[PDB]
């Protein structure tokens, strides 16, 4: 509104050459081709319409695609988990007891997934829903090494998620996950990336979750114009760098990847969810999965299954390590800053 930063101030309002571009176009000339040679309210409602009319006088910023999806709140809880977490959508659940009968190698129990999932519908009642990211960490917490913060994820879930004995669902949904790998219907073939949390509107039994299926994170209309900001938070058991572990100190844009690990043994099967940050091409990633996760390759013939997640566009990608309070429990959480979401597909490595 006519400040005194008058050098580049015109450039941020969209510039100085734009009036010069409009000088040869609009200011001059006769070309295209020429010839030869009622005290408070009203005006409060009046300045309300004036707050509408100024938006009609005129019409940089990137583009979004917001997605809404009304989802029951058994497994995931957008209430407990703050704005800026990952969300993972699921398929339809009744295809699970039939596809386990066919894709199973001979000598395995096909009727395990039909009963393990059947005891979660009987545990979540104590339909393509949603599972948030922080709920999924504590289910696979029994296969992470430091294990101090894998139990910190499990601490705030049983006490804060909407639902009676979500920890009973945790030992059932992880039993559902351990029934996935055994019955050969793999969990990467079910989980679908949904956007990061910007807002959610709940009700009885269900919630209207809004997210960002494509775009940046930090400038979304959150819904509350008091706080139009939202940063991405990931717990420290799933966050795996690859720049420090290989002395790769060179700057550049960084990529984000989801990574699953499988472990196929006779009634000793583990699950793990990792979120890998790297500067590597997606064609030059499976060699790194050979390097760290060749340990489960010897015991296993798919052993890993990954998917793209998004891009940190900074020449120096920026990380933070704080302990946010999920209710009354502090969990070590890696903070990612300025993430531009671009989804992708999955991959098998048999």
């Amino acid at each position: 509104t006519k400040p005194l930063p008058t050098a580049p101030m015109a450039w941020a309002e969209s510039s100085p050459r734009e009036l010069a571009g409009h000088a040869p176009l609009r200011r001059v000339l006769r070309p295209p081709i020429a010839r030869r040679d009622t005290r408070a309210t009203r005006d409060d409602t009046e300045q309300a319409v004036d707050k509408i009319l100024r938006g009609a006088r005129r019409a940089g910023a990137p583009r979004y695609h917001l997605t809404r999806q009304v989802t029951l709140t058994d497994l995931c809880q957008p209430n407990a988990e703050r704005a800026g977490a990952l969300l993972l959508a699921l398929r339809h659940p009744t295809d699970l007891p039939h596809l386990a009968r066919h894709r199973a190698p001979p000598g395995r129990q096909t009727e395990r997934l039909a009963e393990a999932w059947g005891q979660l519908l009987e545990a979540s009642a104590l339909r393509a829903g949603l599972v948030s990211f922080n709920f999924l960490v504590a289910a696979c917490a029994a296969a992470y090494d430091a294990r101090d913060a894998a139990e910190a994820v499990r601490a705030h879930i049983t006490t804060n998620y909407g639902g009676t004995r979500a920890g009973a669902r945790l030992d059932r949904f992880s039993e559902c996950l351990r029934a996935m790998v055994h019955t050969h219907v793999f969990p990467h073939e079910v989980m679908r990336f949904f956007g990061g949390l910007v807002s959610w509107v709940t009700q009885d039994e269900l919630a209207s979750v809004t997210a960002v299926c494509s775009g940046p994170q930090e400038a979304t209309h959150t819904g509350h114009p008091g706080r139009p900001r939202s940063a991405v938070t990931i717990p420290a058991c799933a966050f795996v760098d690859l720049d420090a572990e290989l002395c790769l100190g060179g700057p550049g844009a960084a990529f984000l990847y989801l990574v699953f690990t499988y472990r196929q043994c006779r009634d000793q099967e583990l699950c793990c969810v990792y979120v890998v940050k790297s500067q590597l091409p997606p064609r030059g990633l499976e060699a790194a999965l050979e390097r760290l996760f060749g340990r489960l390759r010897i015991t296993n013939c798919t052993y890993a299954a990954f998917a793209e997640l998004g891009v940190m566009p900074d020449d120096s990608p920026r990380c933070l390590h704080r302990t946010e309070r999920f209710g009354a429990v502090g969990v070590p959480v890696v903070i990612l800053e300025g993430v531009v979401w671009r989804p992708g597909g999955w991959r098998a490595c048999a």
Binding site: P16, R17, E18, L19, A20, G21, H22, L25
Partner: protein
């Protein structure tokens, strides 16, 4: 409107005739390309001034 000519028998008589056609307009276009260059955008825009 076509004409006749009268004739003697025993040839059965011919009557005045008429003709009606319509036709359907057929449609075409033409094309030519004007393309500019980047620096020419900068100068006209006023950015490189």
């Amino acid at each position: 409107h076509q004409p006749l000519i009268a004739r003697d028998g025993p040839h059965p008589v011919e009557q005045p005739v008429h003709n009606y056609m319509t036709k359907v307009i057929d449609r075409r276009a033409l094309n030519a390309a004007f393309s500019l260059a980047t620096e020419a955008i900068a100068l006209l825009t006023g950015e490189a001034l």
